[PDB]
């Protein structure tokens, strides 16, 4: 089915959401 | 598909959490 | 699809594991 | 169905990426 294809596509989105934030939390912690 | 569903709904709520929880975090480093 | 459905569960199971390391993260800085 | 299982794919990728990212965060927090 293509829902649940656009599903995975809008959780995947969200992942690199995560991705981004942790980008900026490692460098306020100096990482 | 009602089951996959409920399990995409608890994977976007997961998702949304994580999210806010990393938001507050940045938030507090920032500070 | 059963197959769909159960990974569906992994995921889930994954976003469990980042919540508990978050958890542990929260309490590493205080929060 | 090859297309979903390319985007399960990528997610898990995501995950365990996530999880080590935060693994590397609470173990030099932790330090
Ligand atoms: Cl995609
Ligand atoms: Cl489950």
Redesign the interface.
């Known amino acids: 089915?293509k829902?649940?294809?656009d599903?995975?596509?809008?959780?995947?989105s969200?992942?690199?959401?995560?991705?981004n934030?942790?980008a900026?939390?490692?460098k306020?912690?100096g990482?």
Chains 1, 2, 3, 4 share one sequence.
């Open positions: 089915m829902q649940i294809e599903k995975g596509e809008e959780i995947l969200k992942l690199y959401h995560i991705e934030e942790l900026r939390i490692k306020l912690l990482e």
